[PDB]
Symmetry: C3
Subunit: 332 residues, 3 copies
């Protein structure tokens, strides 16, 4: 059974086909690819873009999305195997996945890490358990990676430069400030897709402690070797933005300080100058800026940058609708 | 771009057309006016009638409504301009409105005042910000006015008297009791529409402190001059209900005591006799009674009055469905 | 007006017709029985299977379900008659049922007992009030009985044995452990339907204190007399499972300890051995096991039993979709 857990599991030809179908749906949005079919959108965390785009995408293709929130309107779910369920969880994922599988044709799942222990969060237990027990395709709506965001981002870039071939473009994935440590998911995904697309990628971050998990650094290395791009880690702002064609910002807590954010607070607070502003963007080769959203203004990026004509964040957000319809169409 | 923020922004001919389309939809409820289209229903507060009627209205016209709850299932939104977003809000309305605008064809918004400072609540910041940044029409689902309720109310009255011309009818907008101070929204709207319709309006309230905001008292004065009706403020129950054709009840906290409700409590508590009962309704010219709902029985109105054949509250509630379909159809 | 509050209110011919239409829908799931129609699914408690199956069922028949949660996204509702509503409730069921009745064609309602006083919970006030004031058919989505579960369960059994006639089969409704006292609803329903189907029913429970409310014991006695089956209460595990054809497990708090669960805790805790495991199921006549779900693994039933090919819980869950479509189709 084929799922959409990560773009890394898909071949370049399959991803290219997805992006092309997405472009096609953008030209003709109403279709019958999901006529009479349904998708269960399981959210373990809040969402505005993902819930809205998936719900509308199902509707536009003749299907129907059922939105579920375990712990809120639905029952809390247990994922550990061979355990005595006398705690807070009411039912096991083994039953939940099988039951949903008797109702819907697709299952989307959003589950952010707990932020207590990265060693446990990095296993991607929720998503993997759904994929393991579900008899129908499972779609990652964001866990420790955000593959739907990757494709919306990729499409937006191809549309901006007017070509599907992004090789040679200078891509800067820069860390940004936030009063708290966040999920590395979007950063993991940006690094993954930018390298898979063969761009010259530079991972700009405050210190070596902010380098992404080895898993993704390795995916990136393997992607560069196959795509013809390049990977580089940098801690110098100016040399990074210089001649950049694309700048993608995202904040995340240093992995080594996972679970023990107390001492990491004073560390992030001394790098508030990583905020994307006009000065930095002026160093780029008339580069484009984007963010997965939601974005805190004057913290992650300045009002000027957000309101700049070079900001394609709204276009990237729109593309979430189109690429997700291509994904559901391909899996059903 | 045309929005539906207040009936006051619309000409009498445009409002008449809306009411007529509403009557038409009431006769033939299924249509294709919104086929393949969608509306984002953004709720910052609870709702039963508004959410249900809008969701069903979109469905009956071939469209689809996406229900969003910021702070609950969606991310909290910031509305202030040029501010450092390092607080509770995750994203700015500038981005939210633009993003939604890439997904849906219409946006409905419900946001009650905070009740901390009327000077700030009366600016109608949430609704105005959506209308300012949204590339698609915005619909008021209740903020400091409730225009959809106005039209449902107006239609119900025209149906009751069997004519679209309500001039000459004696209309009484009376304040009612409630253990707490409420939003003046529905009262502001009732005063607005009753005068726009040219009726002889009397604003019955305990003391001069319960007179509505000047903005609406002025809209009313201007409406009377154009419609041929009349406006009057009264603090005497009996003289008010006398010969009334319509009685609309609604409770609200005295504006001058906004933010400082402590001393206003003992003031409202000594006017519990404003409750609409059989004795008062018996003084009317076989008048009709209604309320926007939800209504607390034996507090705002008695069981007898609510169960009376002269109570058209259920009809007014139904009409919310029909007038909203006319509104969405007109804006799309 | 015909409602679906309990199978006991329906004749055997009407129930048989429902089960047959359910089997028909299982073969051809898309239809137009609810084209342009809608159902309001009112949930006063969480739900995964019921919300999903009803929402999808409405969709597959061309209709639309509106999901409402009083106290959450909708306003809290008052059910007591002739009372001063100055408390937590905002509106009365008399108005809520009438209003919904002007919007939708069917109303489903889920409301679990409060667990404070069985004498009050057993009156089934919420469901009865909806049926009393609603101008459209009302459907029980689980209160003190779970009739939709009964039919899904019954269909699954007929499919398993390959015949609609279940007379003669040995049916064991066994109590199971849980760190807390639960609703007797599913147990009440299992006893009701198993006897209505004419099976040889044995109510297995720890002590006489765990015998179900007289209302259902009497329904069962009357059912046996009409169906040709039999009813028996047992406190001996081994003699119960012996030669059983079906074993349905469910946990519930002893009625006599309702409201005062403190002393009932040490009582349930000494019967943890009622958990359905391989040893017990091995005593059956190659019997089938099921549970309404959600189910806590290694508490109510063991991993082995749940993963056994004799467990038809997933099939029973699926059937909720089919029998509910038959119910809505019959009532509309």
């Amino acid at each position: 059974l084929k799922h959409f857990l990560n773009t890394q599991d898909w071949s370049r030809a399959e991803l290219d086909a997805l992006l092309t179908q997405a472009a096609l749906f953008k030209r003709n949005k109403l279709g019958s690819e999901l006529k009479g079919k349904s998708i269960a959108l399981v959210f373990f965390n809040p969402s505005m873009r993902t819930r809205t785009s998936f719900e509308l995408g199902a509707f536009q293709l003749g299907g129907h999305a059922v939105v579920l929130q375990p712990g809120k309107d639905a029952w809390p779910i247990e994922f550990n195997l061979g355990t005595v369920m006398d705690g807070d969880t009411e039912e096991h994922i083994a039953e939940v996945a099988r039951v949903l599988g008797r109702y819907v044709d697709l299952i989307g799942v959003r589950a952010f890490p707990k932020f207590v222990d990265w060693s446990k969060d990095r296993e991607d237990q929720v998503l993997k358990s759904f994929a393991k027990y579900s008899p129908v395709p499972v779609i990652n709506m964001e866990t420790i990676t955000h593959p739907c965001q990757e494709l919306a981002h990729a499409l937006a870039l191809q549309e901006h430069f007017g070509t599907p071939d992004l090789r040679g473009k200078k891509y800067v994935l820069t860390w940004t400030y936030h009063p708290k440590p966040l999920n590395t998911a979007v950063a993991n995904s940006a690094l993954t897709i930018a390298t898979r697309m063969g761009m010259d990628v530079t991972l700009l971050c405050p210190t070596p402690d902010y380098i992404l998990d080895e898993r993704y650094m390795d995916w990136a290395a393997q992607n560069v070797a196959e795509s013809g791009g390049s990977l580089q880690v940098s801690h110098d702002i100016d040399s990074a933005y210089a001649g950049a064609d694309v700048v993608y910002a995202k904040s995340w807590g240093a992995l080594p300080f996972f679970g023990n954010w107390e001492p990491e607070k004073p560390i992030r607070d001394q790098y508030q100058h990583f905020i994307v502003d006009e000065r930095k963007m002026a160093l780029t080769n008339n580069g484009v800026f984007s963010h997965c959203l939601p974005l805190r203004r004057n913290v992650k990026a300045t009002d000027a940058v957000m309101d700049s004509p070079n900001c394609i964040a709204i276009d990237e957000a729109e593309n979430r609708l189109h690429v997700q319809k291509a994904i559901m169409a391909a899996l059903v």
